[PDB]
Amino acid sequence: MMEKLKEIEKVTKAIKEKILNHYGYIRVITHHDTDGLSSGGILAKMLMRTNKLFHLTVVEHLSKEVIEKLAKENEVNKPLFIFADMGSGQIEEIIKHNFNAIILDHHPPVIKDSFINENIIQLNPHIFGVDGSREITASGVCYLVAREFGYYDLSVLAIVGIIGDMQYNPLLGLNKFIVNEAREYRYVKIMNDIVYNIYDVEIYKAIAYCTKPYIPDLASEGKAFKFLKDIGIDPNKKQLDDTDKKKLLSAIIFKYPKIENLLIDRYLIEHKVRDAFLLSEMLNAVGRNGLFAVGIGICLEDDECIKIGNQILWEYKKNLINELKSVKLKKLNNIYYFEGKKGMIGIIASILVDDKPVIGYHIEGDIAKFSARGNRDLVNRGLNLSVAMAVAKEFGGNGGGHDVASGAVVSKDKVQEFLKRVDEIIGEQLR
Amino acid sequence: MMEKLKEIEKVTKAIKEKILNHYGYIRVITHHDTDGLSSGGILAKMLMRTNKLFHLTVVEHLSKEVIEKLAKENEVNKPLFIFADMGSGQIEEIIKHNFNAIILDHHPPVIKDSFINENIIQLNPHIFGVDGSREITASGVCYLVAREFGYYDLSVLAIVGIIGDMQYNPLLGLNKFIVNEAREYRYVKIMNDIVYNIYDVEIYKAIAYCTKPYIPDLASEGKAFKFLKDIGIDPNKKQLDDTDKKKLLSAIIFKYPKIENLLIDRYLIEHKVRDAFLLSEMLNAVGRNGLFAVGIGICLEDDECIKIGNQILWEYKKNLINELKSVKLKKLNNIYYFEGKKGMIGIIASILVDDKPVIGYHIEGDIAKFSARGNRDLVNRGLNLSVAMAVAKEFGGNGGGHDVASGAVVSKDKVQEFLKRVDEIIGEQ
Numbered sequence: 001m002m003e004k005l006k007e008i009e010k011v012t013k014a015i016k017e018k019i020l021n022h023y024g025y026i027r028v029i030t031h032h033d034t035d036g037l038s039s040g041g042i043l044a045k046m047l048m049r050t051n052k053l054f055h056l057t058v059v060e061h062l063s064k065e066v067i068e069k070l071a072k073e074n075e076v077n078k079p080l081f082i083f084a085d086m087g088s089g090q091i092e093e094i095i096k097h098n099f100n101a102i103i104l105d106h107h108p109p110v111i112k113d114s115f116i117n118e119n120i121i122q123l124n125p126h127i128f129g130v131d132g133s134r135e136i137t138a139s140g141v142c143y144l145v146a147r148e149f150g151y152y153d154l155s156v157l158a159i160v161g162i163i164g165d166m167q168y169n170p171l172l173g174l175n176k177f178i179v180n181e182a183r184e185y186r187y188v189k190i191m192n193d194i195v196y197n198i199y200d201v202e203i204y205k206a207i208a209y210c211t212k213p214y215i216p217d218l219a220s221e222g223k224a225f226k227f228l229k230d231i232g233i234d235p236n237k238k239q240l241d242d243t244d245k246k247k248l249l250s251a252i253i254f255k256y257p258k259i260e261n262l263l264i265d266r267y268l269i270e271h272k273v274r275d276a277f278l279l280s281e282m283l284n285a286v287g288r289n290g291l292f293a294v295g296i297g298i299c300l301e302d303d304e305c306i307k308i309g310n311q312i313l314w315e316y317k318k319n320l321i322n323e324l325k326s327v328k329l330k331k332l333n334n335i336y337y338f339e340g341k342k343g344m345i346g347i348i349a350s351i352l353v354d355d356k357p358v359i360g361y362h363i364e365g366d367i368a369k370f371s372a373r374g375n376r377d378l379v380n381r382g383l384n385l386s387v388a389m390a391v392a393k394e395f396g397g398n399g400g401g402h403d404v405a406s407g408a409v410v411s412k413d414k415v416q417e418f419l420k421r422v423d424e425i426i427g428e429q430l431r
Numbered sequence: 432m433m434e435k436l437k438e439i440e441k442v443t444k445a446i447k448e449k450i451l452n453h454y455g456y457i458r459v460i461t462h463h464d465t466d467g468l469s470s471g472g473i474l475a476k477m478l479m480r481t482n483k484l485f486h487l488t489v490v491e492h493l494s495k496e497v498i499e500k501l502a503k504e505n506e507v508n509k510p511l512f513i514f515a516d517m518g519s520g521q522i523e524e525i526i527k528h529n530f531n532a533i534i535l536d537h538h539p540p541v542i543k544d545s546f547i548n549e550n551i552i553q554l555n556p557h558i559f560g561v562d563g564s565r566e567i568t569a570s571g572v573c574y575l576v577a578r579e580f581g582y583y584d585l586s587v588l589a590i591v592g593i594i595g596d597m598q599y600n601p602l603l604g605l606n607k608f609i610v611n612e613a614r615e616y617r618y619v620k621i622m623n624d625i626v627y628n629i630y631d632v633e634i635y636k637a638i639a640y641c642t643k644p645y646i647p648d649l650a651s652e653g654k655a656f657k658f659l660k661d662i663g664i665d666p667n668k669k670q671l672d673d674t675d676k677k678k679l680l681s682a683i684i685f686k687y688p689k690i691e692n693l694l695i696d697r698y699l700i701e702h703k704v705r706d707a708f709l710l711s712e713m714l715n716a717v718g719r720n721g722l723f724a725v726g727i728g729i730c731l732e733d734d735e736c737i738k739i740g741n742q743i744l745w746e747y748k749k750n751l752i753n754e755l756k757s758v759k760l761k762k763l764n765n766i767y768y769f770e771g772k773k774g775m776i777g778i779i780a781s782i783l784v785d786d787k788p789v790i791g792y793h794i795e796g797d798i799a800k801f802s803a804r805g806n807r808d809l810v811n812r813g814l815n816l817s818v819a820m821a822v823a824k825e826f827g828g829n830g831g832g833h834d835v836a837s838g839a840v841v842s843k844d845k846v847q848e849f850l851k852r853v854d855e856i857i858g859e860q
C-alpha cells in the first residue's frame with residue numbers, strides 16, 4: 001500500500017508540475033452529485049493556494065455536445081482543463097480536440113495509460129489495479145493530487161465523497177488510507193454511533209425523515225414522537241445517549257429487525273458542518289436542486305451557503321418521505337415493483353429494498369425504463385440483477401448492470417410480461 | 432445623507448435583478464490592490480450565495496490591449512462582465528465592443544449616466560455627488576450591491592477596502608454608513624489603540640517595520656529594541672498595556688514632535704484575520720507579489736492562504752524598509768520623483784508625500800510605469816493627479832486615476848514626460 005502510493009506518486013508529481021507551470025486560464029469541469037461537488041471543493045482550495053484563478057463548471061454528463069462546446073473556448077487562449085469524476089470514458093473525444101487536460105476519474109478507463117500524449121495526464125485508479133467502484137472515489141483521486149502540495153486538511157472533503165458515493169461500508173484500499181491519514185493529522189475523529197445522531201435536530205424529526213434506513217411505521221413526526229415518548233426518551237433532545245440508544249434499539253427491532261443498519265462509524269471532520277454524513281446529505285440535496293455554486297460555497301465553509309444548504313436539505317428530506325409514502329408497491333413472487341417518476345425511481349427503489357429486490361419503472365414515450373435494486377445480503381444469497389435485467393433482450397429491449405443495481409428498457413406494452421420473466425429468474429437465483 | 436442611498440438603491444436593485452436573471456457565464460475583473468482584492472472577495476461570496484458560477488480575473492491595469500482580449504470571449508457564449516474598481520474611465524471602449532457589463536467603479540466617470548444603454552449599468556458614486564476619493568471605495572460599491580441581498584456580513588471586506596484606500600481618517604459619508612451598519616449587525620467593534628498593537632508580533636519588530644508612521648531613526652530592529660529598553664518596556668512583549676502605551680507615546684512625541692497617527696481607531700472584524708488594518712496590509716503585500724488567487728483565498732478565510740499571507744506580508748515589510756533607506760528622491764519644480772521596484776512604487780510615494788506630490792516609476796521592458804501620490808491638503812489646493820497623468824497620450828501612452836492618486840504608462844521619455852506633469856501641477860496650484 002505504501003508501495004502502490006509510490007507508483008501513483010509518479011503521476012501525481014507530474015500533475016503537480018503541470019499545474020504549477022501553467023499561467024493561463026484554468027477550466028474545472030465536475031459532476032453534480034456529492035462526490036463531484038466535493039471534488040470541485042478540493043480542486044478549488046488547492047488551486048487558490050497555488051495562486052491559480054479558475055473557472056468552474058458543473059455538468060450532469062460529458063456528452064459529445066458539451067465536449068464540442070468548451071472546445072470552442074480552446075481556439076484562442078488554450079486553457080488547462082481539469083476533469084473530475086469524468087473524462088476517462090470520453091478520452092477519445094478529448095484527444096480528438098487536442099485539449100490541454102488533466103483527467104481525475106475513477107470510472108473504468110477506455111485507454112489504460114496515465115500519460116496519453118504530450119498534453120494529457122490521466123489519473124485513474126484502475127490503471128494501478130484499484131477498483132474505482134469500491135476502493136476510491138473521485139474526491140479521493142483529487143485528494144491524492146492535493147496531498148502532493150501537503151494540503152492534508154482537504155482530506156475531510158474526500159471523506160465526504162467517500163460517503164456520498166457509498167464506499168464507506170466496508171472501507172477499503174485507498175479510501176481506508178485516506179481516512180487513516182485524516183485521523184493521523186487530526187482532521188477527523190471516528191465514533192461508532194446511531195444514525196439518528198448525525199442530524200443535530202430533535203430526534204423525533206431525525207427518525208421521522210430518515211431514509212437510511214427508511215422505517216415506514218415511524219416516518220412521520222407524530223408516530224416518531226409517540227414511539228419515543230412510549231419508551232421513555234425525550235423526543236426533543238438532539239442527541240441520544242447510550243441509555244437512550246439501548247432502549248431505542250431494543251424497541252425498534254420489532255418494527256425494523258435489521259438493526260445493524262442503524263449503527264454507523266460517524267466521521268467528525270474539521271469543517272463548519274462537523275458531521276461528514278450530514279455534509280454529504282446536504283451536498284446531495286443541494287446538487288439535486290441545481291444549487292451547484294451554493295454547494296461549492298458549502299465546501300468552502302461560507303456561512304450563508306451552509307444556511308441555504310440546511311434549509312434545502314430538510315425540504316428535500318420532507319419531500320422524499322412524501323414521495324415514498326405515495327409509492328404503490330406491488331408484489332410478485334420474488335420481487336416488488338412500482339411505477340414512479342423519471343428522476344427518482346432509482347433512489348426510491350434503493351430506499352425501499354428490504355427482503356426482496358425492488359424495481360421501479362417510468363413510462364416516457366412507448367419505452368418504459370426500469371431501475372432495479374437489491375442489497376448485499378441479497379447478493380450473498382445469489383442475486384445478480386445484471387443477468388436478470390439482461391432478459392430485456394427477449395422482449396425487444398436492453399438491460400444489465402451490477403449484481404446489486406441494474407437498469408433496463410422494454411417496450412411499454414411488455415411491462416407485465418417482462419416483470420414476470422424477471423421475477424422467475426430471480427426466484428431461481430435465490431434457491 | 433440617507434437620501435443619497437435612496438437614489439443609489441435604484442441602481443443597486445437593478446444590478447441585483449440583472450445578476451439574478453443571467454444564467455450563462457459570468458466574468459469578474461478586479462484590480463490587484465487592497466480595495467480590488469476585497470471587491471473580488473465580496474463579489475465572489477455574493478455570487479456563490481446566489482448560485483452563480485463565475486470566472487474571476489485580476490488585472491494590474493484595464494488597458495486597451497486587455498479590453499480587446501476579453502472581448503474575444505464574447506464571440507461565443509456572451510458572458511455578463513462585472514468590472515470592479517475599474518471600467519468607468521475605459522467606458523467608451525467597453526461600449527465599442529458591446530459587452531454585457533456591470534461597472535462598479537469609484538474613479539471619476541467619463542460618462543455620467545447610470546444606465547448607459549440596455550447592455551451596461553454603471554454604478555459610480557461620483558454620478559450621485561459622492562467623492563470616490565474620500566467617501567466610498569470600490570469595496571463599498573460592491574457592498575452596496577451585496578446588501579440588496581442581505582449579505583451584511585460582507586461589510587467586513589468593505590471596511591478592509593476603506594482602510595487600503597486611505598479613507599478611514601476622516602471616516603466620511605457612505606463609508607461612515609457602512610461602518611455603522613457593520614457595528615449594528617455586530618460584525619465590527621471599534622477600539623482606539625496604538626498602531627503597533629495591530630501586528631501581534633514583538634513590539635520592536637512592530638516599530639522597526641512600521642511605515643505609518645514611518646520613523647527612519649527607529650526603522651531597524653536594533654534601534655527599536657534599544658529605544659524600548661531605554662524607557663522600561665520589554666521589547667519582546669507582543670501587546671502594550673496602557674502604562675507602556677503612555678510611556679511610548681510621550682517618548683516618541685518628545686524626540687519626534689511632528690509625528691502623527693500613533694493612536695488609531697482599530698477595526699476588529701468578524702474574520703479569521705480579526706484586525707482589519709492587518710488584513711489590509713496583508714492583502715496589499717500579497718497583491719504586490721502577484722499572488723492574486725491567494726488574496727481572494729484570504730478574503731474567503733482559507734487557513735493556508737492566510738498562512739502564505741502572513742509570510743509574504745513580513746517579507747514585504749522588510750523589503751520595503753530596505754527600499755525606503757535606499758531611495759533617491761529628486762526635486763523638480765513642484766514634484767519629487769524617484770525610481771524603484773514595481774511592487775513598491777506606489778506605497779513609497781505616499782509614505783514620502785509631505786509638501787509636494789511624489790511620483791515613483793519603474794522600467795519594465797520598453798516602457799515606464801508611474802505612480803503619483805498627493806494628499807488631501809494638496810487636492811484642496813487644486814491638485815487633481817487624474818488630469819495631470821492623463822498627458823501620457825501626449826507621449827504615446829495613457830494615464831488616469833483619482834485626483835489624489837493616479838498612474839501612467841510608457842515609454843522611455845521619463846524625464847520628458849516628468850517635465851510635462853510638473854507643468855500642470857504649477858497651473859493646477
Ligand SMILES: Nc1ccn(-c2oc(COP(=O)(O)O)c(O)c2O)c(=O)n1
Pocket residue numbers: 346370371372399400401402405406407408
Ligand atoms: N448494459 C448495461 C450495463 C450497465 N448498466 C448500469 O446500470 C446501472 C444502474 O441502473 P440505473 O442507474 O439506470 O437505474 C449503472 O450504474 C450502470 O452502469 C446498464 O444499465 N446496462
Ligand SMILES: Nc1ccn(-c2oc(COP(=O)(O)O)c(O)c2O)c(=O)n1
Pocket residue numbers: 462464492516517520538777801802803829830831832833836837838839
Ligand atoms: N489610466 C489609469 C486610470 C486609473 N488608474 C488607477 O490609478 C490608481 C492609482 O494609481 P497606480 O496605478 O499607480 O496604482 C488606481 O488605483 C487606479 O485604478 C490608473 O492607474 N491608470
